[PDB]
Amino acid sequence: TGAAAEPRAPVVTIMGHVDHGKTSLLDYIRSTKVASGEAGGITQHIGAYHVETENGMITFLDTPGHAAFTSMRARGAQATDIVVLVVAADDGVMPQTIEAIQHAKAAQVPVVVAVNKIDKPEADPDRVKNELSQYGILPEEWGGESQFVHVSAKAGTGIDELLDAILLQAEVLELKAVRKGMASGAVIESFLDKGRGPVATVLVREGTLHKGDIVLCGFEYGRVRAMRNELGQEVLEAGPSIPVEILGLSGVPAAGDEVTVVRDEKKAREVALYRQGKFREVKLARQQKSKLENMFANMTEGEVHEVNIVLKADVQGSVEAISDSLLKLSTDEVKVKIIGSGVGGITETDATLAAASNAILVGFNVRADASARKVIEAESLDLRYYSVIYNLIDEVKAAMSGMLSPELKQQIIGLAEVRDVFKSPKFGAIAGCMVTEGVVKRHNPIRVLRDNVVIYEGELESLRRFKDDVNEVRNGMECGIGVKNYNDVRTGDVIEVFEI
Amino acid sequence: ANIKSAKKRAIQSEKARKHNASRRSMMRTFIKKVYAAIEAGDKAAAQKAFNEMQPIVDRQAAKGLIHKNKAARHKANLTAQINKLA
Amino acid sequence: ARYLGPKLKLSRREGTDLFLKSGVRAIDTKCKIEQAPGQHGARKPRLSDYGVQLREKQKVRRIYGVLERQFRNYYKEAARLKGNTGENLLALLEGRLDNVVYRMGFGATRAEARQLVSHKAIMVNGRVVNIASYQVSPNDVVSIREKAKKQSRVKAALELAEQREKPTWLEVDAGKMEGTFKRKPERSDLSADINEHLIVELYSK
RNA sequence: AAAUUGAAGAGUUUGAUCAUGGCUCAGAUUGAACGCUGGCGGCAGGCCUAACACAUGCAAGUCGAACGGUAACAGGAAGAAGCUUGCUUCUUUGCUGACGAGUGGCGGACGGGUGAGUAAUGUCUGGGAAACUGCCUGAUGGAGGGGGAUAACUACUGGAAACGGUAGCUAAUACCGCAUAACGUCGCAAGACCAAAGAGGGGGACCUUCGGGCCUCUUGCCAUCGGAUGUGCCCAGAUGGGAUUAGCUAGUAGGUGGGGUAACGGCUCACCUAGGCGACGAUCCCUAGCUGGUCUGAGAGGAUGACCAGCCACACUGGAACUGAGACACGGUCCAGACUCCUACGGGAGGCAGCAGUGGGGAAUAUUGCACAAUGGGCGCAAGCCUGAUGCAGCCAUGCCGCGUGUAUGAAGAAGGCCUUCGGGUUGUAAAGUACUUUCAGCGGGGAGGAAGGGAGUAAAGUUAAUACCUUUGCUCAUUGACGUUACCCGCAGAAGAAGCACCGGCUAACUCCGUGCCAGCAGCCGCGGUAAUACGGAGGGUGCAAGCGUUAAUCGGAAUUACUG
């Protein structure tokens, strides 16, 4: 209330094809350079960092661009007032970059861009402008108000222009916020900690906070125990501009959503439980449909063989995002499904979950609990943690590829022609043979054919030469053969034995 | 130690420990001289040694290094034995 | 915490008038008094021994407006107290303020009297008592407080009261709208088709 | 006067019966959970599981009236100046209000947490004799004269950090001699031997080296004998089960002597005797903290040991002692182990079973809150500082208790629903209508108590050279509440914002229709379901409870079904 309007620091997100040195732009401004200090060499996580530079104040947010992160780039666009798209003259435009174009226009967020490489001689700006000209986005001096910036990103060259454009682009549009009032906003990323407990990184649209104030995120509710901002361990107050990690919530909330503070917690309890009921009702609803959808007691074909996986990732943002990419590798032949996606770490009921149905237990980042090790070490299971999602997406596929059992044809072991049949009481017949090629074996299957068509098929029961009854006969050595359930032996036909 | 005074107490108790150790070692020495005389059968050496020992088992009692009763037994015990021989 | 539904149903189930309405009307012109509620009211209960005990306890509870928990606690206290337990139960009920307010005629019903109490219209010894179950003692003086004295409910209530049998153990001044709980009522003061010993039997088994 | 003056039975074996005998129900109780539902308040309760592991804050300090002291901030000052001549900013100097770091004193052995270990260096009951015991207390005397050090600091230097190395230098209520020394210790006695410390408040002649002397009172220090409280020790009885455990024991049992403890003692050692325990249960094995009490039962019993209080034991695991009146130390030390954190790679650091909080386990158990205002603890002469003890607040229907969710009037008794032999019955005075009330929630207004003290002055007594000071007791003045928007009282608006849960075949309070058809399903026990199902599922109606109601779990009861009573 009061309709108080105060200026704020613009929240900016950056998108692109992987490798435009999107991270480098931030770290150089931050004077940090945390890049390539982490596993994978690339940024697989989202974070927001506010810096203090003239003129005024500005904060930076970044999301990696990959086929896998469909959700993160979608949510990051609508939350930010200004979007930046990194582009390289060497890279040009790529299908991941055009994917970022749609997120800029659909979120009706104004866009400014920067050329990443002025250092390399084979890199030219004119190529970037013209090729992206075809797309309505990124006009330059054509009356489309969009401005291009040329930065070294390694050289650390201004930048002066890019920074100015960003400040100006936020300046030309009216900045609306309020210093005091009812706090509200969105959640960047949520994860689970062992000592601290469940936490969330929250952008506050209206900037206000207090240790005693009750906060409600999604269907989760609770009082804030403590506040943490970036490196700073404790902050007393937080404005609509700078982001602050929230702590003390009941449980790990959704990867992102609208958060609203309330006066009293008791009034907010019924509301939070109400959202759970709807989410549970649709959960059972989608459960009944998928099972009844087949309209039959089983699958019409032999794809029934499937693989199960168990996943718990430390961060809440990943489990929803990478699972979508994990359902992309799914095929009709082998079906893979996720069971019991966790908010973090590992637990007794999780190891029990993998005990009932055979599955691989994997985590984006996790450590084994003291009670967890006892169960995993006892029963036969597999515990594998992966720093990057790419090494994970490859091996799950590997697990699936192995599952397959296809025999498309075998290699004959030997081929033999039979002559001068003999009579035996046990098998009913013994066909004298002469091996023309290869080696005949006992338990290997055979194909009996006459005039190129197969008269009969079977697997050898007895291979006997003379009274020796040897298990193996080479080529051009007299040999003997008999089999059960074969009535008629005729000369001129050839028996083909083949290994499997 | 974690607390300010806890740190200080450990320092003081170590000083006291080295103080007490020194005086206590001295005292037992002068007690042992008496038992050694006794075991060699000399009245005089053992009485003489008892007279040097007396004031210091008494003093260390007054000073809390030992209790009064300990000082007394030592004097009682040695006195018993030395008299029993000469 | 209070029975809020239809009242004559209760009378109809127990087979008697429970005085849950003012008494301005012959009860038989307001309901089918001699028939239980429901589709099968005409049906007769060939009623077990447990049944007669239950219904008698219900009857007394429904007269005084007491739910089970409080009434059981009333039995416990009657039992603990010296002298006949059954009679002690009725002393305790009859000593309730909502009840006494009704008997002095300040309320047309115990329900109405209870509302008077809850709504801070009743004083005991010139002190405001607003809880219905307040136990009233010999020599206490309960009164309508000055501001509640012009309520027309109270005048009507005192008129009807004047037409009921007049209780011995209360001295009521209708003009002042004050009255005095002289003494605990004896057993002989209270209706004789209440079977306390049945209620006593129900709660000992 | 009163204060254990109290005790129920039902269903189910059979065609039926009586007996036998188990199963099952009605009852109370719970640190509960789950399902449906959910308005307010008072009081209580809240990790029963992993004695699993823990990020972060906080949970033990305080005294300048013991001491050298200034680095912070605060004034003050010869003298620098802000100078617009009384307002002042900085250079200086501990001059003082205070106070970081340091020595020193007292407290860190209490308060708080847990129940792992322990069938006995435990607990309970009742007794013993060989002992110590800070602070507080009564008694009687000391409190003399000296000495060598040291942290801080200064200079030089090593470390990433933690924390060091050299040499200087200095104080004390730190530390040590010497004297003094009995109603003390040793000794038959004669004799021999043992301690200490100052610091403040005020002041009359008197005066100096202007520090004080000296006068005076407060307080601390030493000795010895007591009191009080605390603690150590010893004996007897009782305090779980198992013989599908019957033998156990070399410090073992005792004796002598030396040593040892605060003290008795195989506590320890040497020597000697050959004992000691055990079917009245030793040894071994399993389990477990004990009690007051708690729940149940008419009782006798049975079950049990959260919350409150007493004792014990433990403090990451195993071991150890140092300091101290007290510890083998919950936020001390050392060693070893398990584990974790920091690191510039060389080295460091830590222990939530304190209060919050986190991960984990689980069917399941709360906020990283406010305040020292009150009671109580530590330090201090005090003022005061510290106190996650405690007082309070938040969360959860977890339980107990209270209250509300309206009161009265309202008939051919409407519409709708339900049953019906279509006559009518019912839901039902229920609803609508009509008046009427306003608790509680909402909103404004006012306003107890938990506050005793402590602070300035004042006056009187005891003091004393003294009207100082000190201390006690009266007087006035101005003040101290985290809870707090307190309890409670007054006003405003309108029935307005406040009803669900299980059950209805017998046991067992509550019956009909439709659907289904040995299916779908119910089910505490018997037992329901194949065309009339009061037993399934829906409906209408009804019964029982009610901010709860059901289901599950759990102890005792009924069970005279371990029977001492019986």
CSV table of N, CA and C (backbone and C1' of nucleotides) in Angstrom, one decimal, chain D residues 308-340:
chain,number,residue,atom,x,y,z
D,308,C,P,11.2,-31.7,34.4
D,308,C,O5',10.5,-31.8,35.8
D,308,C,C5',9.7,-30.7,36.2
D,308,C,C4',9.3,-30.9,37.7
D,308,C,C3',10.4,-31.3,38.6
D,308,C,O3',11.1,-30.1,39.0
D,308,C,C1',8.6,-32.7,39.0
D,309,A,P,12.7,-30.2,39.2
D,309,A,O5',12.9,-31.2,40.5
D,309,A,C5',12.6,-30.7,41.8
D,309,A,C4',12.7,-31.7,42.8
D,309,A,C3',14.0,-32.5,42.9
D,309,A,O3',15.0,-31.8,43.5
D,309,A,C1',12.1,-34.0,43.1
D,310,G,P,16.5,-32.3,43.2
D,310,G,O5',16.7,-33.6,44.1
D,310,G,C5',16.6,-33.6,45.5
D,310,G,C4',16.8,-35.0,46.1
D,310,G,C3',18.1,-35.7,45.6
D,310,G,O3',19.3,-35.2,46.1
D,310,G,C1',16.3,-37.2,45.5
D,311,C,P,20.6,-35.1,45.2
D,311,C,O5',21.1,-36.7,45.1
D,311,C,C5',21.4,-37.4,46.3
D,311,C,C4',21.6,-38.8,46.0
D,311,C,C3',22.6,-39.2,44.9
D,311,C,O3',24.0,-39.1,45.3
D,311,C,C1',20.7,-40.5,44.6
D,312,C,P,25.0,-38.6,44.3
D,312,C,O5',25.3,-39.8,43.3
D,312,C,C5',25.7,-41.0,43.8
D,312,C,C4',25.5,-42.1,42.8
D,312,C,C3',26.3,-42.0,41.5
D,312,C,O3',27.7,-42.3,41.7
D,312,C,C1',24.1,-42.6,41.0
D,313,A,P,28.8,-41.5,41.0
D,313,A,O5',28.8,-41.9,39.5
D,313,A,C5',28.9,-43.3,39.1
D,313,A,C4',28.4,-43.6,37.7
D,313,A,C3',29.0,-42.7,36.6
D,313,A,O3',30.3,-43.0,36.2
D,313,A,C1',26.7,-42.8,36.4
D,314,C,P,31.4,-41.9,35.9
D,314,C,O5',31.1,-41.5,34.5
D,314,C,C5',31.1,-42.4,33.4
D,314,C,C4',30.3,-41.9,32.2
D,314,C,C3',30.8,-40.6,31.6
D,314,C,O3',31.9,-40.8,30.7
D,314,C,C1',28.4,-40.5,31.8
D,315,A,P,32.9,-39.6,30.4
D,315,A,O5',32.1,-38.6,29.6
D,315,A,C5',31.7,-38.9,28.2
D,315,A,C4',31.2,-37.6,27.5
D,315,A,C3',32.3,-36.5,27.4
D,315,A,O3',32.0,-35.7,26.3
D,315,A,C1',30.5,-35.7,28.7
D,316,C,P,33.1,-35.4,25.1
D,316,C,O5',32.9,-36.6,24.1
D,316,C,C5',31.6,-36.9,23.7
D,316,C,C4',31.6,-37.9,22.6
D,316,C,C3',32.4,-39.1,22.9
D,316,C,O3',31.7,-40.1,23.6
D,316,C,C1',33.1,-38.2,20.8
D,317,U,P,32.3,-40.8,24.9
D,317,U,O5',33.2,-42.0,24.3
D,317,U,C5',32.6,-43.0,23.6
D,317,U,C4',33.7,-44.0,23.0
D,317,U,C3',34.7,-44.4,24.0
D,317,U,O3',34.3,-45.4,24.9
D,317,U,C1',35.8,-43.7,22.1
D,318,G,P,34.7,-45.4,26.4
D,318,G,O5',36.2,-45.8,26.4
D,318,G,C5',36.6,-47.1,26.1
D,318,G,C4',38.1,-47.3,26.1
D,318,G,C3',38.8,-46.8,27.3
D,318,G,O3',38.8,-47.6,28.4
D,318,G,C1',39.9,-46.0,25.3
D,319,G,P,38.8,-47.0,29.9
D,319,G,O5',40.3,-46.4,30.0
D,319,G,C5',41.4,-47.2,30.1
D,319,G,C4',42.7,-46.4,30.0
D,319,G,C3',43.1,-45.5,31.2
D,319,G,O3',43.5,-46.2,32.3
D,319,G,C1',43.5,-44.4,29.1
D,320,A,P,43.4,-45.5,33.7
D,320,A,O5',44.2,-44.2,33.6
D,320,A,C5',45.5,-44.1,34.0
D,320,A,C4',46.2,-42.8,33.7
D,320,A,C3',46.0,-41.6,34.6
D,320,A,O3',46.7,-41.8,35.9
D,320,A,C1',45.9,-40.8,32.4
D,321,A,P,45.9,-42.0,37.2
D,321,A,O5',46.2,-40.7,38.1
D,321,A,C5',47.5,-40.3,38.4
D,321,A,C4',47.9,-39.1,37.5
D,321,A,C3',47.7,-37.7,38.1
D,321,A,O3',48.8,-37.4,39.0
D,321,A,C1',46.9,-37.7,35.9
D,322,C,P,48.7,-36.2,40.0
D,322,C,O5',48.6,-34.9,39.1
D,322,C,C5',49.8,-34.2,38.7
D,322,C,C4',49.5,-32.9,38.0
D,322,C,C3',48.9,-31.9,38.9
D,322,C,O3',49.9,-31.2,39.7
D,322,C,C1',47.7,-31.9,36.8
D,323,U,P,49.5,-30.8,41.2
D,323,U,O5',48.5,-29.6,41.0
D,323,U,C5',48.9,-28.3,40.4
D,323,U,C4',47.8,-27.4,40.1
D,323,U,C3',46.8,-27.1,41.2
D,323,U,O3',47.3,-26.0,42.1
D,323,U,C1',45.5,-27.7,39.4
D,324,G,P,47.5,-26.2,43.6
D,324,G,O5',46.0,-26.3,44.2
D,324,G,C5',45.3,-25.1,44.2
D,324,G,C4',43.8,-25.4,44.1
D,324,G,C3',43.1,-26.0,45.3
D,324,G,O3',42.8,-25.1,46.3
D,324,G,C1',42.4,-27.2,43.4
D,325,A,P,43.3,-25.4,47.9
D,325,A,O5',42.2,-26.4,48.4
D,325,A,C5',42.2,-27.0,49.7
D,325,A,C4',40.9,-27.7,50.0
D,325,A,C3',40.4,-28.6,49.0
D,325,A,O3',41.1,-29.9,48.9
D,325,A,C1',38.6,-27.4,49.8
D,326,G,P,41.3,-30.7,47.6
D,326,G,O5',39.7,-30.9,47.1
D,326,G,C5',38.9,-31.9,47.7
D,326,G,C4',37.5,-31.8,47.1
D,326,G,C3',37.4,-32.2,45.6
D,326,G,O3',37.1,-33.6,45.5
D,326,G,C1',36.3,-30.1,46.0
D,327,A,P,38.0,-34.6,44.6
D,327,A,O5',37.7,-34.1,43.1
D,327,A,C5',36.4,-34.1,42.7
D,327,A,C4',36.3,-34.2,41.2
D,327,A,C3',37.2,-35.2,40.5
D,327,A,O3',36.6,-35.9,39.4
D,327,A,C1',37.5,-33.1,39.6
D,328,C,P,35.7,-37.2,39.7
D,328,C,O5',36.7,-38.4,39.7
D,328,C,C5',37.2,-39.0,38.5
D,328,C,C4',38.1,-38.0,37.7
D,328,C,C3',38.7,-38.6,36.4
D,328,C,O3',38.8,-37.6,35.4
D,328,C,C1',40.4,-37.8,37.7
D,329,A,P,37.6,-37.4,34.4
D,329,A,O5',36.7,-36.3,35.1
D,329,A,C5',37.1,-35.1,35.5
D,329,A,C4',36.0,-34.0,35.5
D,329,A,C3',35.6,-33.6,34.1
D,329,A,O3',34.3,-33.0,34.2
D,329,A,C1',36.8,-31.8,35.2
D,330,C,P,33.1,-34.0,33.9
D,330,C,O5',32.4,-33.5,32.6
D,330,C,C5',32.7,-32.2,32.1
D,330,C,C4',32.1,-31.9,30.8
D,330,C,C3',32.3,-30.5,30.3
D,330,C,O3',33.4,-30.4,29.6
D,330,C,C1',30.0,-31.0,30.4
D,331,G,P,34.6,-29.4,29.9
D,331,G,O5',34.3,-28.2,28.9
D,331,G,C5',34.5,-28.3,27.5
D,331,G,C4',34.0,-27.1,26.8
D,331,G,C3',34.3,-25.7,27.3
D,331,G,O3',35.6,-25.3,26.9
D,331,G,C1',32.0,-25.8,26.8
D,332,G,P,36.7,-24.8,28.0
D,332,G,O5',37.8,-26.0,27.8
D,332,G,C5',38.0,-26.9,28.9
D,332,G,C4',39.4,-26.8,29.4
D,332,G,C3',40.4,-27.7,28.8
D,332,G,O3',41.0,-27.2,27.6
D,332,G,C1',40.5,-27.8,31.2
D,333,U,P,41.9,-28.1,26.7
D,333,U,O5',43.1,-28.6,27.7
D,333,U,C5',44.2,-27.8,28.1
D,333,U,C4',45.2,-28.6,28.8
D,333,U,C3',45.8,-29.8,28.0
D,333,U,O3',46.7,-29.4,27.0
D,333,U,C1',45.2,-30.5,30.2
D,334,C,P,46.8,-30.3,25.7
D,334,C,O5',47.4,-31.6,26.2
D,334,C,C5',48.7,-31.7,26.8
D,334,C,C4',49.1,-33.1,27.1
D,334,C,C3',48.9,-34.1,26.1
D,334,C,O3',49.9,-34.1,25.1
D,334,C,C1',48.1,-34.9,28.1
D,335,C,P,49.6,-34.6,23.6
D,335,C,O5',49.5,-36.2,23.7
D,335,C,C5',50.6,-36.9,24.1
D,335,C,C4',50.3,-38.4,24.3
D,335,C,C3',49.5,-39.1,23.2
D,335,C,O3',50.4,-39.4,22.1
D,335,C,C1',48.6,-39.7,25.2
D,336,A,P,49.8,-39.4,20.6
D,336,A,O5',48.9,-40.6,20.5
D,336,A,C5',49.4,-42.0,20.5
D,336,A,C4',48.4,-43.0,20.7
D,336,A,C3',47.2,-43.0,19.7
D,336,A,O3',47.6,-43.6,18.4
D,336,A,C1',46.3,-43.1,21.8
D,337,G,P,46.9,-43.0,17.1
D,337,G,O5',45.4,-43.5,17.2
D,337,G,C5',45.1,-44.9,17.3
D,337,G,C4',43.6,-45.1,17.3
D,337,G,C3',42.8,-44.4,16.2
D,337,G,O3',42.8,-45.1,15.0
D,337,G,C1',41.7,-44.1,18.3
D,338,A,P,42.5,-44.4,13.6
D,338,A,O5',41.0,-44.0,13.6
D,338,A,C5',40.1,-45.1,13.7
D,338,A,C4',38.7,-44.6,13.9
D,338,A,C3',38.3,-43.4,13.0
D,338,A,O3',37.9,-43.9,11.7
D,338,A,C1',37.7,-42.9,15.2
D,339,C,P,38.3,-43.1,10.4
D,339,C,O5',37.6,-41.7,10.6
D,339,C,C5',36.2,-41.5,10.4
D,339,C,C4',35.7,-40.2,10.9
D,339,C,C3',36.1,-39.0,10.1
D,339,C,O3',35.4,-38.9,8.9
D,339,C,C1',36.1,-38.5,12.4
D,340,U,P,36.0,-37.9,7.8
D,340,U,O5',35.8,-36.4,8.3
D,340,U,C5',34.5,-35.8,8.4
D,340,U,C4',34.6,-34.5,9.0
D,340,U,C3',35.4,-33.4,8.3
D,340,U,O3',34.8,-32.9,7.2
D,340,U,C1',35.8,-33.3,10.6
